[PDB]
Amino acid sequence: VCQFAFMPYNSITWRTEHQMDPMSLDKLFGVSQRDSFALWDIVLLFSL
Amino acid sequence: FSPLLLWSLLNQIGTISMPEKVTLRISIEGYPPLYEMEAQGSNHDNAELGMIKPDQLASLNQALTDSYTTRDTNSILRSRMSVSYLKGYTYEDILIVRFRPESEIYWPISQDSRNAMIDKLSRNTSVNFEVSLEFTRPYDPNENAALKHSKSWLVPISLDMTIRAKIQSALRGDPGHPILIPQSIPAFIQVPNQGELTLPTSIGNTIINDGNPRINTTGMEKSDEARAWFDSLTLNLEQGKSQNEKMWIATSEHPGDQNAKLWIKTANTTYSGRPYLQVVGFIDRAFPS
Amino acid sequence: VRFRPESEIYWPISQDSRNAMIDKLSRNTSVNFEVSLEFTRPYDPNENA
Amino acid sequence: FSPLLLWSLLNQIGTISMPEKVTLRISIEGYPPLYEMEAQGSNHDNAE
Amino acid sequence: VRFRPESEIYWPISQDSRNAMIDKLSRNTSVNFEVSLEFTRPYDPNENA
Amino acid sequence: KASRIPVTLVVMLVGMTLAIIIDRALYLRKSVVGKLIYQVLMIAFLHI
Amino acid sequence: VCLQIFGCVFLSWFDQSGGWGKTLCIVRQLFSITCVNNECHVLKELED
Secondary structure (H helix, E strand, O other): OOOOOOOHHHOHHHHHHOOOOOOOHHHHHOOOOOOOOOOHHHHHHHHO | OHHHHHHHHHOOOOOOOOOOEEEEEEEEOOOOOOEEEEEEOOEOOOOOEEEOOHHHHHHHHHHHHOOOOOOOOHHHHHHHHHHHHHHOOOOOOEEEEEEOOEOOOOOOOOHHHHHHHHHHOOOOOOOEEEEEEEEEOOOEOOOOEOOEEEEEEEEEOOOOHHHHHHHHHHHHOOOOOOEEEOOOOOOEEEEOOOOOOEOOHHHHHHHHHHOOOOOOOOOOOHHHHOOOOOOEEEEEEEOOOOOOOOEEEEEEEOOOOOOOOOOOOOOEOOOOOOEOEEEEEEEOOOOOO | OOOOOOOOOOOOOOHHHHHHHHHHOOOOOOOOEEEEEEEEOOOOOOOOO | OHHHHHHHHHOOOOOOOOOOEEEEEEEEOOOOOOEEEEEEOOOOOOOO | OOOOOOOOOOOOOOHHHHHHHHHHOOOOOOOOOOOOOOOOOOOOOOOOO | OOOOOOHHHHHHHHHHHHHHHHHHHHHHHOOHHHHHHHHHHHHHHHHO | OHHHHHHHHOHHHHOOOOOHHHHHHHHHHHOOOOOOOOOOOOOOOOOO
C-alpha cells in the first residue's frame, strides 16, 4: 500500500531532493521506490 | 594496533582560504589586451565579489531539479547528477563575481602595432582570441606561497573573408561595427585546491541537452562539446575624443533561452546602467595534507 | 631604500572607471587603501627559483 | 660515535644573497594603482 | 623567434621621472642597460606549475 | 576524499578483537549464562 | 489491455480544470494509466 504512486515521497522531486541523505524518512522506514523487484519477501513467506 | 591509530591521528584534512581577487583578460594572441579587468572584495560589503545569497541558491536548485521530461529515462540521470553535484557545495563555498563592462585602462597600443594586427588579420593568418581568468587566494603562513589558479581559452576567428574584413574595420576605429566572440567566459566555473579551473561538465551537459532550445552538436569535435555551453561576447569600441583614449565595452549573451530560470539573473551598474559580467565560482576547500 | 616621491608612470585610469570609483566612494561603501611592498633577490643556482 | 659526527658535518648553514629590487604600490582596492614605484641599485654607487 | 622591431606600447614615463633619469645620466652615476629574455611553456597537469 | 582511514575503523577492529578474546574465554570456562548474555548484547549492538 | 488504449490516446479527457479533477487524477494514478507503448509519441501539451 505504501508502494503506490500518490504517496508524497514516491514523487520524482522528493526522490531527487532526498537521494543522497542516508537517513531519509522513506529510507528509515524501509519503504522506497525499489524499482527493480521485491522477491525475497515472497520466498520467505512461502518457505514459512 | 598502535601503528594504525598513530597513522589515523597523524593524518588530518586541512582547509584553504576563500579566494580573494579575480582577474579577466580578453585579447588577441601576441598583442596587448583588448579588455583587462580585476575585482577584489571584502566578501560582506562589496558587490563585485561576494557569497551567494540563500535565495539565489534555492532558486538555482529548484530550476536545476525541475528540468526534465516525463518520457525519456536518460534525462532523469542527468538531472540527478546535476543536483547531486550542486548539493556538494553549501552557500558559503559558492561565490559570485561581477566584472564591470567597461575596460579598466585605456588601450595602450602603438600605431605600428595596430597596423601589424590589421595586416595579420587580412590575408590568411589564423589568429585566436584569448580569454584568461585568474583566481588568487590570501597568503597562508602554512605554505610559503600564494595559491593561484589561471585558465586560458583560445577561440578561432574563422576563415570567412567578410567576417575578417568587418573585424578589421572594427579594430581600425570605424564606428558602428562590433566584434562577436562565440564560446567565451563560462557562467559556472569551479576552482580546485591545486589544479586549474575545471568546468562543471554535469551542468554543461544539462544546459546543452536538457533545455527546450536544444543546441545541435552533431558536426563538432570532442574538444568542442565541453565548450558548446559557453556564452557569447560582444565587444564595441568607444572613442569620443580624437586619440589617446580608446575604450572597449564587453557585453555577454547566454546561449539558448535567455530567460531560463537556470541562469542567475544579472545586475545593473549603479554609475552607468550597463549590466555586469557574472561568473559563478564553486570553491574546493580541502587538501589531503 | 629611497623611493622617489614622484610617481613613475602617468595614471592609466579610464573615465568610466574613475566615475565608478567616485560612485563607490560616495554613499556607504567601505573602501580600503592598499599599500604593497615587495623585495626580490638575485637568482641563485642552488634553488631554481 | 660515527653517526653523530656524520650528521653534524652533513648538515650546515647556507647563505642567501642580498635583495636587489624593491617596489612600492599605493592604490585603492579593485582599481589601478595610484602611485607605483620601484628601485634597483648597484649597492655601492647608487643612492636609491 | 622573430620580434617586431617596433615597440609594442607607447612609452609610459613621467616628465619628472624622465628629468630624474637625465640627471642620473649626467654627472657620475654608472647606469646599466638591462636586457631580459623570457621563455614560458604551456601548462602541464603532471606538475602544478 | 575518503583517503584517510578513520579512527572508528581501528577502534571497531579493537572491539572485534576483544569480542574474539571474550568468546574464547567464555568457551574455555564453560559458562552458558555468560555466553547467552554476550550473544544478546552482541546481537543488539550489531543491529543498532 | 482495454484501459491502455483508452488512456494512451484520450489522455486529454483527463484534464478537468478543478474539483473533480483532483479525484480524477488520483483514480488515474492508482489505475496505472499511461502509454506503455514506446513507438507512439506521448501527448505533448499535457506536460504539466
